[PDB]
Ligand binder design. Structure first.
Ligand SMILES: O=C([O-])C(=O)[O-]
Ligand SMILES: O=C([O-])C(=O)[O-]
Ligand SMILES: [Mn+2]
Ligand SMILES: [Mn+2]
Ligand code: NA
Lengths: 296, 339, 338, 296
């Protein structure tokens, strides 16, 4: 029996998420909750069999058959208002906004720790793409510092990241530490307007001991990449992990450098919107794992 | 006072050439010498602005904040400027720089991406910082398009928007057309600046073109101290501006002495118009890529000229030095495979 | 074909920077590389032209005539040019350069002194040489006065008259006005050229201004290899001319390789935009004075910068290096008495 | 008594020579011979009490009263035609033209050798100015090479020097060799258009042995300057002789460098016209020695 889930939000993210959820072995989207009766998102959900509404989250919380899971892609302010209502109603929430009222989760790194959480947060696209690599290195050796550089097509950066570019860099850097296991994290984001739009790519630099077991590190990275591929098929390693000795450039630190490319599934979002696709792919993954662990 | 305000960026853009190895002794000596010569604005930061110290751009020998702090304690007339890039630095960095004595905040975005800086200009103005905006890699788009991005910065609180030839790729009228377009759009709302590189050997003349087109602020570095083949040399800008009746308030002989006796010894070598730099200027490659390309060339045994040409073809922009590694490996892969 | 004929003077003007120490091996390699990159004219002489080897300007390591001969035997497409200054070289030197395979005779006078070159242009044409005229220190007189002198040269047989910014002192419009004045005065009678130094960082731009004003010949040197802060760098000229649609017939990548791999190793160091060169440009000092001033500064324990500043005040012109010693002694006396 | 001398030609050199002859204790100018009846030189001559003519040299050959000595400042063409006539008439001739039908004379060097000559030539201004210095060095040590640099006001350089600049350099270099005593000679002339016009100066470079007696050389140079000063008062050393060791610049040759300045008397020509002055002063000196020795 598939867990019955609701989607709050009716924009691009929500619509892409709807399509992924329809494909799910473990989840069944049944409700799409919006506020704009004009919303194209609500129209699409109706056509596909979902029950839709424009009276917002209060309408959802007054339904006889409560959702087992709720995915929210609205805004931090909106989800932060709704979150207490989900918890009282006993509905597990997966938050795709920057609200972060609940623990941030990256599936190959800390998802298992939080399967019982009533509210989980999907951090950032940069986090979802790069933190598994940082984790893959730090589970093998001490990583005093790790640095991620995200490169994204300008057209696939909406007003959200654009208005809050700092929060992206700070939040991602924080996840690199707390979830990635690096002692200090840094994140950089580059918006490139090249036409045709670039597929998102990410470079991950991790400081490692000068005597580090490089083969074990490389093997660990390959393992985490295959793992991420179970839920993001277009997540690809561009080169072997590259190793370097201490230098002026690296501030006397030995390091390993990993390059990934994140191609979207093209469900609703275009392939070059891997930054958005990875959010909805990761969210779906987290939802399915919760359903398997606590809901079946 | 001046017809054009000169900003020296020997200690910011020059950090690229220095590979971010500046010491307090070097910054203090240089700030004092430039200050005494009459330079009204001295920029001090990591080459990639606040938060630049990293694997991607190179670690600083001395934390930039300490250098800004020392610069502000040294300068008697000059104001200290600092650069920051949204997506690299943060608002927290801007506040820290302000607290350390920086009084001019220069916020840089790729020329098509001004809307990411709106909150940064707002904060900078609220902290009582003078604002300058950089539209980087300005050769990649048409004047009218650049002017629309300048208007975004202006509306956000930007007091002067620069046309920035990051790749040293603009030629004369290309600078004038861009500067005039910004002047026409901004009017009284903001000044217009130009900051050029020397990769086609046109730093000084491009700056003159900008001034004739209406620019009121011009960047250079003493002894060209900067990325690529360098920035327009300030000592030469002063010489030329003296002859064409553009007042700067900088004494030619004093700044020449500073360039020669104080700035030069702090440089690892002269800034060269060599094959690599020329390729960047010809190919439209972001100037700070130069020494990173040379580094990857050594690391992987491929020619730096090839890395740089391909960076151009890939349309890489500021901040994307990491892709030079990917380009190096691509070359190694094609050499093995025979593709 | 081309819109502008580039002359490389790495092996002539660059002789100043090389201190006239070129060997046959270096000339052979450089001529070969420049020829291959498509450079149509390569100038080879002592920096002060035929007969330049002397105490005053510096002795050649290798006789200039042997360099011309070697350059002519090496070049398969490029023509070999050579410089001569009336009052230094003679008509005899010109004949000898032609006999040695030189095909382009470039005759230089101070810009107010064109009439002393009249019989030299006449002989050169009689010898079947293509002629070029240099009006040196061209920033010192108004464009109209410069144009009058250009007319004397053209009427004597000169086929192209250069505006020569020997001091690297002209700025943009200053070049354009001079080139325009010459084009208007000369009309069909002769082409107009520009030869600029880099003493104010305007070598390439001044060359562009010249071309836009009608110049059909432009001088530069690979890697700036030239007197003072150098000549306009040929490799940058080509890149820039490529962007603005001026045909030269020279491959940018090829000439970039030559400058980097062949010309540069033959240089004692990079040409520098240092304090001394800047002073020269700002003060209107003949570029070749640079290393001679530095030598005198060291010999007499006086600053070179002051020496060069005073050279400008004394209104010295090309050829007056000996006067640098007199200036050095003058500075030395002032210093020696507080 | 005084020898009656004739000046042939009425140009600048002639009219200036006129004043030096007037002040002569051994010479008395009596004829100026011209061709242009309106010449400014002839008018000046006649005004000073000289007989003048415009018929030309043929007229002068027909006067009952024979000149003891004739100075000619016309041209190489004119003097060559006139030269044999002087010889046939038994009139000693001093030639200030480039004709050189008789030996070149520099007073401190080789005048004593040629006092008996029917015809002496005054070589060039650069020669008169610099060759005494070269001689002063070569009479002390071997000089394998000597180099002279003459700097002259542009306005002082007339049509003769300008039309024949190669001949100036070639003739001066040859004289530096044959009269100065250097094995090899070189001359350079620079015309400087500065306003106000520069006083002529000259730089003389002599290669000397590396073990040369520098004190003997400097003493010799000072002696010859004093000698020249007896007929050219404005002739002076700008500096002490400068001695230098073998270098790249000097082609491994040791040398002594001498700087002179030559200010004219301001007779018919302005003081900056020292290049014209030194000819007339030297020519007058030669005439006086000839008059002393062979005549009176
Ligand atoms: O320094 C800079 O910001 C540039 O050139 O783009
Ligand atoms: O001809 C030259 O080299 C000059 O005067 O610049
Ligand atoms: Mn820059
Ligand atoms: Mn030159
Ligand atoms: Na850098």
């Amino acid at each position: 029996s598939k867990a019955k889930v609701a989607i709050v939000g009716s924009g691009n993210i929500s619509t892409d998420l709807l399509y992924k959820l329809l494909r799910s072995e473990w989840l069944e989207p049944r409700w799409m909750v919006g506020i704009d009766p004009e919303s194209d998102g609500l129209a699409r959900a109706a056509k596909l069999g979902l029950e839709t509404t424009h009276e917002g989250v209060d309408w959802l919380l007054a339904q006889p058959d409560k959702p087992d899971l709720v995915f929210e892609a609205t805004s931090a302010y909106v989800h932060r208002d709704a979150a207490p209502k989900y918890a009282e109603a006993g509905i597990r929430a997966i938050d795709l906004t920057p609200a972060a009222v609940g623990p941030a989760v990256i599936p190959p790194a800390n998802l298992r720790e939080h399967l019982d959480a009533p509210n989980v947060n999907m951090i950032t696209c940069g986090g979802q793409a790069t933190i598994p690599i940082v984790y893959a290195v730090s589970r093998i050796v001490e990583v005093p510092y790790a640095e991620i550089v995200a490169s994204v097509a300008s057209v696939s950066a909406g007003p959200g990241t654009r208005a809050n570019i700092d929060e992206f860099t700070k939040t991602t850097a924080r996840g690199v530490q707390t979830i990635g296991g690096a002692a200090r994290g840094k994140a950089i984001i580059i918006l490139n307007p090249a036409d045709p739009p670039m597929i998102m790519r990410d470079t991950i630099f991790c400081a490692i001991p000068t005597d580090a077991d490089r083969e074990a590190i490389a093997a660990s990275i390959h393992d985490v990449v295959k793992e991420v591929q179970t839920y993001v098929p277009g997540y690809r390693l561009l080169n072997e992990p590259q190793f370097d000795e201490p230098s002026i450039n690296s501030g006397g630190q030995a390091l390993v450098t990993t390059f990934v490319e994140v191609e979207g599934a093209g469900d609703y979002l275009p392939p070059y919107a891997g930054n958005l696709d990875i959010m909805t792919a990761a969210a779906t993954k987290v939802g399915e794992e919760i359903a398997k662990e606590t809901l079946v | 006072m001046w017809d054009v305000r000169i900003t020296d960026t020997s200690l910011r853009d020059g950090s690229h050439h220095k590979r971010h190895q500046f010491t307090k002794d070097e910054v203090g000596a240089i700030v004092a010498a430039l200050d005494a010569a009459g330079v009204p604005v001295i920029e001090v930061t990591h080459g990639d602005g606040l938060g630049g110290s990293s694997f991607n751009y190179g670690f600083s020998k001395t934390p930039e904040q300490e250098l800004i702090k020392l610069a502000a304690a040294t300068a008697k007339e000059a104001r200290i400027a600092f650069l920051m890039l949204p997506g690299v630095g943060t608002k927290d960095d801007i506040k820290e720089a302000r607290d350390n004595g920086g009084s001019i905040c220069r916020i840089a975005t790729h020329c098509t991406e001004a809307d990411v800086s709106i909150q940064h200009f707002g904060l900078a103005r609220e902290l009582g910082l003078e604002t300058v905006g950089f539209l980087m890699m300005a050769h990649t788009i048409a004047p009218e398009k650049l002017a629309a991005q300048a208007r975004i910065m202006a509306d956000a609180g930007c007091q002067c928007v620069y046309v920035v030839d990051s790749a040293g790729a603009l030629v004369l009228d290309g600078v004038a057309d861009r500067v005039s377009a910004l002047v026409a759009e901004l009017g009284e709302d903001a000044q217009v600046g130009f900051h050029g590189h020397e990769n086609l050997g046109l730093g000084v003349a491009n700056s003159v073109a900008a001034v004739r087109a209406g620019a009121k602020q011009i960047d250079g570095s003493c002894r060209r101290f900067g990325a690529g083949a360098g920035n327009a040399p300030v000592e030469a800008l002063i010489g030329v501006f003296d002859k064409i009746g553009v007042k700067t308030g900088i004494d030619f002989f004093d700044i020449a002495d500073a360039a020669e006796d104080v700035v030069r010894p702090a440089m690892p070598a002269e800034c060269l118009l060599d094959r690599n730099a020329l390729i960047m200027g010809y190919s439209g490659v972001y100037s700070s890529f130069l020494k990173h390309a040379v580094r990857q060339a050594e690391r992987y045994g491929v020619p730096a000229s090839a890395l740089l040409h391909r960076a151009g073809q890939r349309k890489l922009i500021g901040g994307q030095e990491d892709q030079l590694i990917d380009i190096a490996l691509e070359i190694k892969r094609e050499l093995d495979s025979g593709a």
